[PDB]
């Protein structure tokens, strides 16, 4: 139940994600991400792109059907008024790419949490262009303490939940449509 590990998919829940948050300690902005793979395919880590912030965790390399990966991120350490924003990319054994955006801002006077999930045709690494697509162009979900569902095409669908504060949990389930 640590970031960088995989757990049985059925075990994923907000308690495990709070555990992940608690392990990062006293930092101002941080995120715990759990993504439950119920897609019928194996996922292999590609990379994480950070627009800002960092993780000390390696993406779980192999995520079999029926497993959830756990991951985390935090703001850059130090007197920088910035949050943690980035895109995770996994390659799926059908030849496509699962991409996940998470965005936790510094200033909640003016900005809000967001996330997004998309499947890309072919093998595509996470990068600043992918961030811009996920954030500006592909209808991200607000981290509004609510669940959101969307078909992903490719026979899959996504259902996820993110809270609205600067200690963020993001729980996503990828299932057969
Ligand atoms: Cl915003
Ligand atoms: N601080």
Residue numbers in the entry: 3 to 179
Q: What did the paper state?
A:
Fragaceatoxin C (FraC)11 is a potent haemolysin of the family of actinoporins, defined as a group of ~20 kDa protein toxins produced by sea anemones. Actinoporins are classified as α-helical PFT (α-PFT) because the transmembrane pore is predicted to form an α-helical barrel. The lytic activity of actinoporins on biological membranes is enhanced by the lipid sphingomyelin (SM) and by lipid-phase coexistence. Here we reveal structures of FraC corresponding to four different stages of its activation route, namely the water-soluble form, the lipid-bound form, an assembly intermediate and the transmembrane pore.
In the monomeric form of FraC, the side chain of Phe16 is inserted in a hydrophobic cavity of the β-core region.
